[PDB]
Amino acid sequence: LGDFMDKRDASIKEQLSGVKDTSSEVKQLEEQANAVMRAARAEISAALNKMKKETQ
Amino acid sequence: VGQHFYWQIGGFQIHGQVLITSWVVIAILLGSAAIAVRSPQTIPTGGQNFFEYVLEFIRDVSKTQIGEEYRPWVPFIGTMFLFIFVSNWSGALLPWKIIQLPHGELAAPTNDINTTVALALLTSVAYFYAGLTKKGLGYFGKYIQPTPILLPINILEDFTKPLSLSFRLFGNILADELVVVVLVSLVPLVVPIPVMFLGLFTSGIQALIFATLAAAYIGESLE
């Protein structure tokens, strides 16, 4: 008579744990979506300047 | 009116009301509990809803009182709740004046000495054991640090509390038996109509107060 309500509350428990790890993953994936173009744009200007020194 | 015993000797003079009433009430209680827990669904269906409502009632009244480890005493206090509940309803309802007994009567388990003093004794054994468990084995709750006088009265109250709860159950169920027997002995039963409601209310709340009073005292055992 106990495990029947244990399951019905454990559903909300696993749900809230899932939403917590979900929000962590959302911020991390948006960080990486910013980061890939940011890394490309920054390093391309880096190589631009460095090769431009030898060009001058 | 005949409450003593009948001579069903078994090594010592044993009470007959005690035996038959407590045996049949335990039997019908386990027959109710066992046949309906065979095939339970995850949804609280017809009887499982009632049984789980009783059990969450016991969960609340055991969670609010005792301490951090009430769950192993939830079986004890819950079977006590169920026993007093069904025995009060059986004393209010189940017919035992049309059936006659040659040597005595047969009304309820708590009408006699044995199955109230047995409850008191089992609770007291549980209190002494739980006090020697949760506290040390040298001196249980008896030991007096602040006051130099409370040393004998500590064991004296630890002796006089279970008998007090016993006398509570006595003064409830014996009074109820007197109500019902004189009220059906008045005249045909056109008189018990309003009194049956008060008896039912008092019996149900008698079960509840016995439950919470067992809870309070295993709480003191924890303390």
Q: How would you label A8-32 residue by residue, b for 16+ Cβ within 10 Å and e otherwise?
A: eeeeeeeeeeeeeeeeeeeeeeeee
How far is Cα B14 from Cα B21, in angstroms, rounded to an integer?
Answer: 13
Stated as kind and residue range, the H or E segment containing A54 is helix A3-55
Would you call B52 and A1 a contact, using CB atoms and an 8 Å cutoff?
yes
How far is Cα A9 from Cα B45, in angstroms, rounded to an integer?
Answer: 18
Helix (H, G, I), strand (E, B) or coil at B200: helix
What is the dihedral angle through the alpha carbons of B24, B29, B31, B37, rounded to the nearest 10 degrees?
-170
Other beta carbons within 10 angstroms of residue A52's beta carbon come to 10
Question: Which of B210, B219, B223, B205 has the alpha carbon at shortest distance from B73?
Answer: B219
Name residue, tokens 């002494």.
B128
How far is Cα B215 from Cα B64, in angstroms, rounded to an integer?
Answer: 9
Helix (H, G, I), strand (E, B) or coil at B191: coil
Name residue, tokens 């744990």.
A17
When computed from its CA atoms, the radius of gyration of chain A, rounded to whole angstroms, is 24
- State how far Cα B58 lies from the chain centre: 14
Helices (H), chain B: 16-35, 48-63, 74-93, 114-134, 150-185, 192-222
Would you call A5 and B52 a contact, using CB atoms and an 8 Å cutoff?
yes
Residue-wise DSSP of B118-153: HHHHHHHHHHHHHHHHHS-SS--TT--SS-SSHHHH
How far is Cα B196 from Cα B29, in angstroms, rounded to an integer?
Answer: 23
Would you call B52 and A7 a contact, using CB atoms and an 8 Å cutoff?
no
Give, as one character, the DSSP assignment of residue B69.
-
Q: Tell me the technique behind this structure.
A: cryo-EM
The token duo for B48 is 């499982």
The token duo for B82 is 């169920």
In terms of C-beta density within 10 A (0-12 exposed, 13-18 middle, 19 or more buried), how is residue B115 classed?
Answer: buried
Sequence letter at residue B34: A
Residue B43's closest chain A neighbor by CA? Answer: A4
Helix (H, G, I), strand (E, B) or coil at A44: helix
Selected residues 9-38 of chain B with any CB under 8 Å from a CB in chain A: 37
The token duo for B97 is 């004046």
Residue A8's closest chain B neighbor by CA? Answer: B42
